[PDB]
Coordinates of C-alpha atoms and ligand atoms in Angstrom, one line a residue:
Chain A
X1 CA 31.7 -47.9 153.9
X2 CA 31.3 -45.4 151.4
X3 CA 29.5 -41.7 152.7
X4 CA 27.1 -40.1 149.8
X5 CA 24.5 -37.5 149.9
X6 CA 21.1 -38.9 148.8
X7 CA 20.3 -38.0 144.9
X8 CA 17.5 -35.0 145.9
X9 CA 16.7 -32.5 146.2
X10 CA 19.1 -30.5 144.3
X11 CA 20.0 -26.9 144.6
X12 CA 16.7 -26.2 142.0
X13 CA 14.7 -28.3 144.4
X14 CA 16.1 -26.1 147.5
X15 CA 16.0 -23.3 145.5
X16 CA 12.2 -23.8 144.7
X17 CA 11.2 -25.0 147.9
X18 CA 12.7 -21.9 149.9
X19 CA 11.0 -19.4 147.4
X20 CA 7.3 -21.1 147.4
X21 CA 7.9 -21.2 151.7
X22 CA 8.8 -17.3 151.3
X23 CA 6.0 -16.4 149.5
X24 CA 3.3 -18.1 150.9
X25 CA 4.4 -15.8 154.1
X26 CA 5.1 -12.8 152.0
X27 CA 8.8 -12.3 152.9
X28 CA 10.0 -11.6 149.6
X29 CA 9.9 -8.2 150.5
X30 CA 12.4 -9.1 153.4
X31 CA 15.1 -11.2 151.1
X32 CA 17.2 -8.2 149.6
X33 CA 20.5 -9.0 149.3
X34 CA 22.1 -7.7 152.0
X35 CA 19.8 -9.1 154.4
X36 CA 19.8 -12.6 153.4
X37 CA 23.8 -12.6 153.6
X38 CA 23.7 -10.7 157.0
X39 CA 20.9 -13.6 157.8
X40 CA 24.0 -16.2 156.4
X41 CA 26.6 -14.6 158.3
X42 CA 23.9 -15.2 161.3
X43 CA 23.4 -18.7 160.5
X44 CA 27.7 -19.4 159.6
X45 CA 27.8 -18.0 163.9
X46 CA 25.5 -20.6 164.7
X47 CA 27.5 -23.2 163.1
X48 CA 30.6 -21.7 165.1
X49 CA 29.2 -22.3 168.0
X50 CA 28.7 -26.1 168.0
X51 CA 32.6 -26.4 167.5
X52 CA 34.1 -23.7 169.5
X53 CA 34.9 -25.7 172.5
X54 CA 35.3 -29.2 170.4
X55 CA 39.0 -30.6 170.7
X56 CA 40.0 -31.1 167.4
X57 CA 42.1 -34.1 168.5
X58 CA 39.4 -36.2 170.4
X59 CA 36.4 -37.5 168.4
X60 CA 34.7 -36.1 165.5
X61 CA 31.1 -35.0 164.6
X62 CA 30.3 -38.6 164.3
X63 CA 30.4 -39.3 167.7
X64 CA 28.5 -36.2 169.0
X65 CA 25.5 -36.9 171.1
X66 CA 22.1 -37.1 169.1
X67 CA 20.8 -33.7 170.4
X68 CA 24.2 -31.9 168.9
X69 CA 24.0 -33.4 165.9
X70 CA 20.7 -32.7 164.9
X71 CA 21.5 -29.1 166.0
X72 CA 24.9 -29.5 163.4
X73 CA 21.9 -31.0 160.5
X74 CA 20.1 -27.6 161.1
X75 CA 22.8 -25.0 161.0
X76 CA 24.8 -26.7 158.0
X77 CA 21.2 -26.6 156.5
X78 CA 20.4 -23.3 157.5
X79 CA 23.4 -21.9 155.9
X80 CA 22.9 -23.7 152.9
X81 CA 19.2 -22.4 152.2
X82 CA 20.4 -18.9 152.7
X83 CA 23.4 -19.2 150.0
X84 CA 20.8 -20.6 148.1
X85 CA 18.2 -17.6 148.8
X86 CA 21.3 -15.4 148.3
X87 CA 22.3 -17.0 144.8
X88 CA 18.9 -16.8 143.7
X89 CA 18.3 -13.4 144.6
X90 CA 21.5 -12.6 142.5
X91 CA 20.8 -14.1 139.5
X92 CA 23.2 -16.1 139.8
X93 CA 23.0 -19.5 138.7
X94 CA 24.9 -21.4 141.1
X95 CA 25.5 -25.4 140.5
X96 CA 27.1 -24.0 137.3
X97 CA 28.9 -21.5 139.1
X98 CA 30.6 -24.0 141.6
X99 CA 31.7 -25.9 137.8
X100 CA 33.2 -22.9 136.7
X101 CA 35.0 -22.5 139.9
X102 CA 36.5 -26.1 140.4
X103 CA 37.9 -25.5 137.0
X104 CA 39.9 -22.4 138.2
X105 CA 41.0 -24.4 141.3
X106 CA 42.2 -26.9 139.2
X107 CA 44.5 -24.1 137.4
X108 CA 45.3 -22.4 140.0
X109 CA 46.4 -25.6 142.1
X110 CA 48.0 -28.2 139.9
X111 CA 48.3 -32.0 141.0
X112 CA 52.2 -31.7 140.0
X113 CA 52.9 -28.4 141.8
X114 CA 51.6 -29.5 145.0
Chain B
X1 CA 11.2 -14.3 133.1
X2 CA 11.6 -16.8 135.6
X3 CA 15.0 -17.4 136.9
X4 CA 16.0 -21.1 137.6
X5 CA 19.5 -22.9 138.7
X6 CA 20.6 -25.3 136.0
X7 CA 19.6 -29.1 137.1
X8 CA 23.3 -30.2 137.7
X9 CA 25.5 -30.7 139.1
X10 CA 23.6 -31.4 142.1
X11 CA 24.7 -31.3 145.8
X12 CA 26.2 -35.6 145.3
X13 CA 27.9 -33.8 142.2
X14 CA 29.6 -31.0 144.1
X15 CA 30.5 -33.8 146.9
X16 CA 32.1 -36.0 144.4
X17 CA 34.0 -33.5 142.5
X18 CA 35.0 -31.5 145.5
X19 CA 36.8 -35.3 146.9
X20 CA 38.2 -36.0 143.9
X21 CA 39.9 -32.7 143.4
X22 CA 41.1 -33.1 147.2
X23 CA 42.5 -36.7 147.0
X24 CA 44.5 -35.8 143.8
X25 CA 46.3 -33.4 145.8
X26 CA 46.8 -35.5 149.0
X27 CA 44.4 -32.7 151.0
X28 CA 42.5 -34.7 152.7
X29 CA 44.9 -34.4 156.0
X30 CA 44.3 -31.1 155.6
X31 CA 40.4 -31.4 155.8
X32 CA 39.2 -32.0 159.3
X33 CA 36.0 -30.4 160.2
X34 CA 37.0 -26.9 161.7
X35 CA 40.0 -26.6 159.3
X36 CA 37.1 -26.8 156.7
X37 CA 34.9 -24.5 159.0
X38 CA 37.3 -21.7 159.4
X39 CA 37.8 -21.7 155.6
X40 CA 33.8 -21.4 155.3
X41 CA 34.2 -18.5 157.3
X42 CA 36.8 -17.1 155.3
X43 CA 34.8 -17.4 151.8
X44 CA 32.0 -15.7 154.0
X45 CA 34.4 -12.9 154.4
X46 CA 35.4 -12.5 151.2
X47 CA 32.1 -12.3 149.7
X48 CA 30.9 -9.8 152.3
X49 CA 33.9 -7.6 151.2
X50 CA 32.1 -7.4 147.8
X51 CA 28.9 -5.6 149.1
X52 CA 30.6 -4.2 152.1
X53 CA 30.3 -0.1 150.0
X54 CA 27.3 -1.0 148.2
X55 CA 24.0 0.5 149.2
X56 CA 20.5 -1.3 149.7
X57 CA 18.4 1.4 147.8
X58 CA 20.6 2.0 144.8
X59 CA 20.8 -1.5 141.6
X60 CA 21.8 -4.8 142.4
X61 CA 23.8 -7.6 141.9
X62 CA 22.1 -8.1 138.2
X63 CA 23.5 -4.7 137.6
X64 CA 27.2 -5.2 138.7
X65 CA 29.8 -5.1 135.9
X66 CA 30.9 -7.7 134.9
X67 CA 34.1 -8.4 137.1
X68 CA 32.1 -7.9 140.1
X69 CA 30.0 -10.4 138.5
X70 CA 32.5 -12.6 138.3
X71 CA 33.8 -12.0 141.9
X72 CA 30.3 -12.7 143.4
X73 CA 29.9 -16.2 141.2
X74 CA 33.1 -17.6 142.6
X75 CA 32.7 -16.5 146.7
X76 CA 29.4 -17.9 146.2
X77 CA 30.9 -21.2 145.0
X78 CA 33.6 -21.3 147.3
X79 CA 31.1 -20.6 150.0
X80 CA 28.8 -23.8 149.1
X81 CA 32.0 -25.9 148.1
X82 CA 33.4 -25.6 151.9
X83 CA 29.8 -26.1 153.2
X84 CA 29.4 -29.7 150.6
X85 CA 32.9 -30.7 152.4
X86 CA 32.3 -29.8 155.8
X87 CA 29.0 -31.7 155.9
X88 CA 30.7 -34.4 154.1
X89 CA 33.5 -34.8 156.6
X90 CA 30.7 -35.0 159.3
X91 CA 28.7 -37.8 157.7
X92 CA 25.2 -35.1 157.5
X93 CA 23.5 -36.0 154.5
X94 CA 22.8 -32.4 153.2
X95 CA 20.3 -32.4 150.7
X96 CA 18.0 -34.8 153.4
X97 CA 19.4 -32.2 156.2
X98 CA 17.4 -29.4 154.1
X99 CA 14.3 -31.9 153.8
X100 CA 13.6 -31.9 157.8
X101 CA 15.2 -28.1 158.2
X102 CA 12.4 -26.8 155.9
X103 CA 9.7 -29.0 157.7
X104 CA 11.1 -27.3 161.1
X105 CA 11.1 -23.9 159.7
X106 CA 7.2 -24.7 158.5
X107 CA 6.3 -25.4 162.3
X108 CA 8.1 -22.9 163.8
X109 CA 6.3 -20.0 161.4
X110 CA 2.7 -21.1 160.4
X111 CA 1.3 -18.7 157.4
X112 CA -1.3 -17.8 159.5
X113 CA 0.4 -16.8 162.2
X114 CA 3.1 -14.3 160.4
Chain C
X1 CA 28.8 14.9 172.0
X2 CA 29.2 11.4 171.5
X3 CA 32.5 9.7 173.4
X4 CA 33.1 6.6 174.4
X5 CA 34.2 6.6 178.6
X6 CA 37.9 7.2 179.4
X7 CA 37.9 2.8 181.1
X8 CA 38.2 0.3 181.0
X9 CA 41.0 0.6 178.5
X10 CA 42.1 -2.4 176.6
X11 CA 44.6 -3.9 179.0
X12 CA 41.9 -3.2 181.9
X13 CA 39.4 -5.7 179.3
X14 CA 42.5 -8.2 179.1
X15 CA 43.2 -8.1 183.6
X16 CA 39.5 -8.8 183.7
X17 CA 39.0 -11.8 181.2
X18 CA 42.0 -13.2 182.2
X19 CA 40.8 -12.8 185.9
X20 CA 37.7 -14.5 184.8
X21 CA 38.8 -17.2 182.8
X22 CA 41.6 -18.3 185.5
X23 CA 38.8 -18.3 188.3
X24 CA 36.8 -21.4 186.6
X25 CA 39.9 -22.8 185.8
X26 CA 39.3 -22.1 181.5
X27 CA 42.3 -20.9 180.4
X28 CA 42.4 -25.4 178.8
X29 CA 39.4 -24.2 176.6
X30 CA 41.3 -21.0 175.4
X31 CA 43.7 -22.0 172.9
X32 CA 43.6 -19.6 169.9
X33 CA 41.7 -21.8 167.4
X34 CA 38.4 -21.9 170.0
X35 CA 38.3 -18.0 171.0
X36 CA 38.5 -17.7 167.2
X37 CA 35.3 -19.6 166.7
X38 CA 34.0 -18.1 169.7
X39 CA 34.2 -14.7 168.3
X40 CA 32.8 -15.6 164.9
X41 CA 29.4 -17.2 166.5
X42 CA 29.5 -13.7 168.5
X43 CA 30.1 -11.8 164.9
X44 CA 26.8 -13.9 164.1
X45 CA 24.6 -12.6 167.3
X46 CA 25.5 -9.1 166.0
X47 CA 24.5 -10.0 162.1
X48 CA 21.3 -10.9 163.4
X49 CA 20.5 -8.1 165.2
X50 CA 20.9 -6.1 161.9
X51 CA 20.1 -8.8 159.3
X52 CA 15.9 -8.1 158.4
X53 CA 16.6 -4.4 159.2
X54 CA 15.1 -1.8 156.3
X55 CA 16.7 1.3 155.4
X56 CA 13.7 3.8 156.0
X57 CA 13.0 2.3 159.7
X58 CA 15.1 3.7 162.5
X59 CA 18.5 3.2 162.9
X60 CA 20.5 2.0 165.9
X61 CA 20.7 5.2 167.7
X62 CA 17.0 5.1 167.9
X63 CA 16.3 1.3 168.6
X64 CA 13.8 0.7 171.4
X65 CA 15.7 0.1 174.5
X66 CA 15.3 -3.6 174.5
X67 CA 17.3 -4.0 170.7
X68 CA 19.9 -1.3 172.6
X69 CA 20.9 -3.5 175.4
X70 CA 21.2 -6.4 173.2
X71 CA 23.4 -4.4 170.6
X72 CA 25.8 -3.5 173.4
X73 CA 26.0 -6.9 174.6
X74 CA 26.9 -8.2 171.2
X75 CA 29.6 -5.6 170.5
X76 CA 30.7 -6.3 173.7
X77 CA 31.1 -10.1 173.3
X78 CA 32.8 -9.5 170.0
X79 CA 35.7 -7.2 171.8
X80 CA 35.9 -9.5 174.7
X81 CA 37.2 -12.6 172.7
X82 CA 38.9 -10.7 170.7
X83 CA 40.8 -9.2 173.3
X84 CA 41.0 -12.7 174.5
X85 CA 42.4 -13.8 171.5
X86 CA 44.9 -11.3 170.9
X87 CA 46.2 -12.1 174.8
X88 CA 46.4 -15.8 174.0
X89 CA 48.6 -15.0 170.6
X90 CA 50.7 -12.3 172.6
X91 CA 49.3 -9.6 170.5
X92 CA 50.2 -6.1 171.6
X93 CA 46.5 -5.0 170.1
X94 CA 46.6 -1.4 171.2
X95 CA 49.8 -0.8 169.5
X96 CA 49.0 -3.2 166.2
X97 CA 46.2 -0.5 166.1
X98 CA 48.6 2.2 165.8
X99 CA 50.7 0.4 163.4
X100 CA 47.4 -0.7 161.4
X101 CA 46.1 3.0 161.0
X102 CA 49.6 4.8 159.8
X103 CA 49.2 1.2 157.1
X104 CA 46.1 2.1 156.2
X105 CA 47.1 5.8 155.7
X106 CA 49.6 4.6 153.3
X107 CA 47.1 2.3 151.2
X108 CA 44.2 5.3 151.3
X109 CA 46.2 8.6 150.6
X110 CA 43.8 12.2 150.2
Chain D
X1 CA 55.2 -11.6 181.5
X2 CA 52.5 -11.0 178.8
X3 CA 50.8 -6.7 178.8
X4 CA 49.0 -4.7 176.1
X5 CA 50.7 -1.3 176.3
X6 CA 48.6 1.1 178.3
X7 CA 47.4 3.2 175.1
X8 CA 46.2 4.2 172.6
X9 CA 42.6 3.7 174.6
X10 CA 39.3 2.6 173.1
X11 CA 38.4 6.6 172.9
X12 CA 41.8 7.0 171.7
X13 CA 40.8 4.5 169.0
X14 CA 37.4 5.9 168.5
X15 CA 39.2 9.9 167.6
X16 CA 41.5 8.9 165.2
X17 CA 39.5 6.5 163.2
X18 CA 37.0 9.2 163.2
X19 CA 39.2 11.7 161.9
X20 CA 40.4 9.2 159.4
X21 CA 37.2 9.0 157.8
X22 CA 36.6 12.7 158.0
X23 CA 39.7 13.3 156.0
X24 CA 38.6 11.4 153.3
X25 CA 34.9 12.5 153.1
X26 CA 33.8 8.4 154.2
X27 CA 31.3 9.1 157.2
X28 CA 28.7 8.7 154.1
X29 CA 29.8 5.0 153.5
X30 CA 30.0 4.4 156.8
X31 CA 26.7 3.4 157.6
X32 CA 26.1 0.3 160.2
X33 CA 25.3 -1.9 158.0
X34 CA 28.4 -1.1 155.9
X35 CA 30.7 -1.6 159.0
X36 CA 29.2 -4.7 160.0
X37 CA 30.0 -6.6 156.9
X38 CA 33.3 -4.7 156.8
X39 CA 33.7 -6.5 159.9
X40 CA 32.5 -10.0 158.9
X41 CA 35.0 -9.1 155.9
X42 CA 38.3 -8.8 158.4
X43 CA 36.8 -11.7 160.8
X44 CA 37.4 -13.8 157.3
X45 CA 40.8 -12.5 156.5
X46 CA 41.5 -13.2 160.8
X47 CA 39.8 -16.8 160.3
X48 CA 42.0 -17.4 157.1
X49 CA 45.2 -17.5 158.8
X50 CA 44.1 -20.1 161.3
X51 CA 42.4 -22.6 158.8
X52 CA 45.1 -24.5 158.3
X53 CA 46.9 -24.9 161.2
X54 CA 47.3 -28.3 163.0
X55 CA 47.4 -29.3 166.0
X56 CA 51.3 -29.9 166.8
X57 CA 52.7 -27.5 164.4
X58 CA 53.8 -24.3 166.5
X59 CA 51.4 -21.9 168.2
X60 CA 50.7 -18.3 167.0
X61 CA 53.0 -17.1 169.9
X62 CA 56.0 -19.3 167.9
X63 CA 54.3 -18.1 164.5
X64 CA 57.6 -16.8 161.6
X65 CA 57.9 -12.5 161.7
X66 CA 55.8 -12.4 158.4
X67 CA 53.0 -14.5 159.8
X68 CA 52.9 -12.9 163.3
X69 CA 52.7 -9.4 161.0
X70 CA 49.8 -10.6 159.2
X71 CA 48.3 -11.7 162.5
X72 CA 48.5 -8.0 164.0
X73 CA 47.2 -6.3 160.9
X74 CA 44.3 -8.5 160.9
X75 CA 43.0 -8.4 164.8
X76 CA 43.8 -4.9 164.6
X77 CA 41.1 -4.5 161.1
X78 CA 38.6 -6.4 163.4
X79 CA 39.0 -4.0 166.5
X80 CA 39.0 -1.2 164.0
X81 CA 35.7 -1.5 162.6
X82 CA 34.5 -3.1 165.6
X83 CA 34.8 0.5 167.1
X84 CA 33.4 2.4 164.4
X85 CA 30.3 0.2 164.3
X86 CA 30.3 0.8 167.8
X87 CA 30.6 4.5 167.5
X88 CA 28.4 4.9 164.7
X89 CA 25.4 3.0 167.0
X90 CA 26.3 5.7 169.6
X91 CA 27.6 2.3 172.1
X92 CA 29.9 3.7 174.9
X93 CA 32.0 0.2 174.1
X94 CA 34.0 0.5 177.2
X95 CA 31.3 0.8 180.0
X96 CA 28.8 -2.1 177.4
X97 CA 31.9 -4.5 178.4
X98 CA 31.9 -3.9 182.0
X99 CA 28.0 -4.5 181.7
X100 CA 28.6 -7.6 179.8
X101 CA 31.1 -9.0 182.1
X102 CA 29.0 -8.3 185.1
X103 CA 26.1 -10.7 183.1
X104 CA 28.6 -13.0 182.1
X105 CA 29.7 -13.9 185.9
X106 CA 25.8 -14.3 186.7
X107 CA 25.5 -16.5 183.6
X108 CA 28.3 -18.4 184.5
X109 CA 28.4 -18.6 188.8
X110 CA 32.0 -20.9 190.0
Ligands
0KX201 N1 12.7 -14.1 156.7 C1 13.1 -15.5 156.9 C2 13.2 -16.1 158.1 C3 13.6 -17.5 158.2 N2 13.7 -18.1 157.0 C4 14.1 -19.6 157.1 C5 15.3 -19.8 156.7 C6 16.2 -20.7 157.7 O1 16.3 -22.1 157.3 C7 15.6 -20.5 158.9 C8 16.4 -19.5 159.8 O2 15.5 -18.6 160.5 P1 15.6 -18.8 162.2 O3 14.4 -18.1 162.8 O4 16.9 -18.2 162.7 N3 15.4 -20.4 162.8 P2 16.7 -21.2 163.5 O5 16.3 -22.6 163.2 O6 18.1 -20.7 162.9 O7 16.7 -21.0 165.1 P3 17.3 -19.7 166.0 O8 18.1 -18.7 165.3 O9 16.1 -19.0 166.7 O10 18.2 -20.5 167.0 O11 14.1 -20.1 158.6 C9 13.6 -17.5 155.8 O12 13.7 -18.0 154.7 N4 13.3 -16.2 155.8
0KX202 N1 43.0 -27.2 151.0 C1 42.1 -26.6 150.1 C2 42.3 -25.4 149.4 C3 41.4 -25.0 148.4 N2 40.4 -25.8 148.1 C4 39.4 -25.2 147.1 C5 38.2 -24.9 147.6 C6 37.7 -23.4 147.2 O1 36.8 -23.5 146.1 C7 38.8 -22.8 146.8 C8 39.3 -21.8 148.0 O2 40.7 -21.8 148.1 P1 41.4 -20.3 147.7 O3 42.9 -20.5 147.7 O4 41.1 -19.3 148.8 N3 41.0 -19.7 146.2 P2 40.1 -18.3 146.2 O5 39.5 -18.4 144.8 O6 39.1 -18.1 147.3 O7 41.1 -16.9 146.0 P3 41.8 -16.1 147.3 O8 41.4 -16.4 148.7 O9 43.3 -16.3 147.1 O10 41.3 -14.6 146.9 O11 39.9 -23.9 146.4 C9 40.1 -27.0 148.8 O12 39.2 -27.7 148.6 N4 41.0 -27.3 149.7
0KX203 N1 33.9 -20.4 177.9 C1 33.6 -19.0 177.9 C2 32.3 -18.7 178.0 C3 31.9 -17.4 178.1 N2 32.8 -16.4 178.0 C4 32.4 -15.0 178.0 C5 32.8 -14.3 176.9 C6 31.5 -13.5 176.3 O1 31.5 -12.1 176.7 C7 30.5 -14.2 176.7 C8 30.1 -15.4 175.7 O2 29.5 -16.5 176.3 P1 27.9 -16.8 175.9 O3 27.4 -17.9 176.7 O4 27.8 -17.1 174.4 N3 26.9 -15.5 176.4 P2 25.8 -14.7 175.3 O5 25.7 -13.4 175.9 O6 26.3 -14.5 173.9 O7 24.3 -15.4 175.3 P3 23.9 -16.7 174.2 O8 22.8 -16.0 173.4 O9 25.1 -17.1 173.3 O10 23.4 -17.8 175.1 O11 30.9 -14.8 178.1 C9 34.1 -16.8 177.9 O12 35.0 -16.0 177.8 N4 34.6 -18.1 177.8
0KX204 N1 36.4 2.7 153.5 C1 37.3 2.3 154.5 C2 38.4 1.6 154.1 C3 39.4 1.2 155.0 N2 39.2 1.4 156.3 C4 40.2 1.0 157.3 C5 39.8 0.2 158.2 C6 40.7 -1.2 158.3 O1 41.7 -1.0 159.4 C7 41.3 -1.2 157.1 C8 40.4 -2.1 156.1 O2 40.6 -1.7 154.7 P1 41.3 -2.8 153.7 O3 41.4 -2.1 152.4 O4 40.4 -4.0 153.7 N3 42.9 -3.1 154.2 P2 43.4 -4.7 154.5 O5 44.6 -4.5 155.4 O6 42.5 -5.7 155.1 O7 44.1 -5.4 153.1 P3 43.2 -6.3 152.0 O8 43.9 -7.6 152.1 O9 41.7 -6.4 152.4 O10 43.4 -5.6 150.7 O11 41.4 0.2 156.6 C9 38.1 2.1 156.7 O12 37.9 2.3 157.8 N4 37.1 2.5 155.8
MG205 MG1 18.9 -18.7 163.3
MG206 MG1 20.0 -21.9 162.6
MG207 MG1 39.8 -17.7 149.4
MG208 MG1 37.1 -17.1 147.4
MG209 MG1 26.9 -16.2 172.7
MG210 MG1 26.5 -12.6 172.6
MG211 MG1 40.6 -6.1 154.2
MG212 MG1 42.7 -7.0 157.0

């Protein structure tokens, strides 16, 4: 059957959901740059971790046990609201970033030459 | 002013775009979940390399020129594009993983408590 | 005068994880692909020990003794699967090292 | 049989990236928090020649000349700044690993 994320929210929505949660605790003063990709880097470990000892010949993240993957949910989130944070932080505007990118893959990597 | 993300393409967007790209160049053997992983961690690496020098105290991103700019926009992207494809791969509805994440993080760190 | 002790060396590191592994009978959850995981989720423990850290507070030479020990353990688990790893690929790593620096002498000339 | 070569040692390592950086005037940008995501840096370019490699395709021990090259340069970059982060924290690396294995058979009793 066909896999699709659900339509929300979208990287506005995370973006404006992380930054309302952040400063209602007043830990705006904690999300300079380099601490919210160190806190990333952090979270990308976590991530590690779930795999390191996975086969990657036996079965996938589907069949994972219910505990391990809710624990795979929260550290692919996790990362994600941090990019997000990061982005944000930045200035940088990031779903049109990623469309600016997939255009230069596309150069870089073209159907014929590969 | 305030700074927002544009409202597309959303994370169902990347997804879709991302597969397509993929299944034009016959890439999805090469997608398994800690193939996808380990490229994650690679993008993490390359955009740490860009404020590896830079100091905390001294401007910003927003002050960057503009090929550093640049640089950041596209480790960014290649960041959350791995991330869309990895949680793809393992069937985790992102944008509804974030929902529960944040709901989590709300619980664990109560305003009144921090 | 700040050294670091004479041993274990970097072979000594590799006897005793290899020691260790082959004792609990590990060495099937060692291939390459795993310690390199490994290591990154260690490389993560170590971000977080620096990640909400502010420039004016003290730095890691004057942590509280609790932060100490768990920034020694975390180094530590970083150079003990990467030691690991370099075994498992037949990497002479004490002698890439060598070959590394006079590289890097090369790229970063006075 | 499999042996890292005896030196240089993790002191040996220690001096000569030390005086390195001195050469080039670099202990300023050499801050922990600097090295740290130098080393999350290297850990990618490490990570990147693993990503993708399947299963039955040979092992890094069986990797071509130019691809076992790149492999050296790149655990060697991770043990590099793995010991200056270490240094800079004031860590005696060598005796924090014998600590940490001593935990690490507690943690994990046969
Ligand atoms: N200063 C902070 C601290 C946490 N957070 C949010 C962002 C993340 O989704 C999440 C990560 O923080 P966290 O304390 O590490 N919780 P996590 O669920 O990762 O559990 P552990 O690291 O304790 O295993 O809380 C934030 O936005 N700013
Ligand atoms: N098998 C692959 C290879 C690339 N890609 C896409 C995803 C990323 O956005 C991007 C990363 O691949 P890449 O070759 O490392 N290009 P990148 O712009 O990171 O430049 P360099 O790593 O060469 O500096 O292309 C993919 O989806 N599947
Ligand atoms: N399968 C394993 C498990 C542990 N080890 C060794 C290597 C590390 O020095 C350390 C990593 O294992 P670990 O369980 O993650 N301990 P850690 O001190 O990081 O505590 P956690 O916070 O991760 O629970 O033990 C190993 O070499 N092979
Ligand atoms: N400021 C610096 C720059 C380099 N170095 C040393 C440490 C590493 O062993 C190595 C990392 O620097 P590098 O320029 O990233 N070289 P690298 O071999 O990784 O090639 P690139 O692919 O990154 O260009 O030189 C340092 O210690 N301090
Ligand atoms: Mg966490
Ligand atoms: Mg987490
Ligand atoms: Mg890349
Ligand atoms: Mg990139
Ligand atoms: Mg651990
Ligand atoms: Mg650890
Ligand atoms: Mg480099
Ligand atoms: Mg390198």
């Amino acid at each position: 059957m066909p896999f699709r994320f659900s339509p929300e929210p979208t990287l506005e929505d995370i973006r404006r959901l992380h930054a309302e949660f952040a400063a209602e605790r007043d830990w705006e003063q904690f999300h300079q740059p380099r601490n919210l990709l160190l806190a990333l880097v952090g979270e990308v470990g976590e991530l590690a971790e779930l795999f390191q000892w996975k086969s990657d010949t036996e079965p996938g993240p589907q069949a994972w046990p219910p505990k391990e993957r809710a624990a795979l949910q929260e550290e692919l989130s996790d990362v994600l609201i941090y990019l997000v944070a990061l982005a944000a932080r930045c200035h940088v505007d990031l779903p049109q970033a990623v469309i600016s990118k997939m255009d230069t893959n596309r150069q870089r990597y073209p159907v014929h030459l590969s």
